[PDB]
C-alpha cells in the first residue's frame, strides 16, 4: 500500500444516547494521541438515530498491528470518561492498496 500501510478504521457505537454529549476516541498508539481525549477524536452519528445508534469515525492506523483503542464520554468540554476496563483493538493488514478498516465501539 502507499505510505505505511496505512488502514482506515471506522468506530461504530451502539449507544442511542443524546444528552448533548460526543463519543470521542483515543487509542493505544501516538495516532489517536497515545491516550490523550483530547487529543483523541471526537466522533459522530451519520447513522446513528434511533432504530439502530452507531457512531462513527475513521482514524487512520499505518503499520500492522491489533492496535488497542477505547472510547470516551466527552462532555460539551474536554472532561471525560474513559475505556471501561477490556478497551479494544484493531489489527492493520501489512498488504493493501487502500486504506479501511472497522472497530465497533459499545458506549451503552
Same mark, same amino acid.
Given at each position: 500500500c502507499t505510505?505505511?500501510?496505512a488502514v482506515a478504521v471506522t468506530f461504530d457505537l451502539t449507544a442511542t444516547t443524546?444528552?448533548?454529549?460526543?463519543?470521542y476516541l483515543v487509542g493505544s498508539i501516538s495516532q489517536l494521541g497515545d491516550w490523550e481525549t483530547s487529543?483523541?477524536?471526537?466522533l459522530s452519528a451519520d447513522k446513528y438515530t434511533s432504530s439502530d445508534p452507531l457512531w462513527y469515525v475513521t482514524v487512520t492506523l499505518p503499520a500492522g498491528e &491489533?492496535? /488497542?483503542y477505547k472510547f470516551i464520554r466527552i462532555?460539551?468540554?474536554? &472532561?471525560? /470518561?474513559w475505556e471501561s476496563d477490556p478497551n479494544r483493538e484493531y489489527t492493520v493488514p501489512q498488504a493493501c492498496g487502500t486504506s479501511?478498516?472497522?472497530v465497533t465501539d459499545t458506549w451503552r
Open positions: 505510505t505505511p500501510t443524546t444528552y448533548g454529549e460526543n463519543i487529543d483523541g477524536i471526537a &491489533s492496535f /488497542e462532555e460539551s468540554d474536554d &472532561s471525560v /470518561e479501511t478498516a472497522t
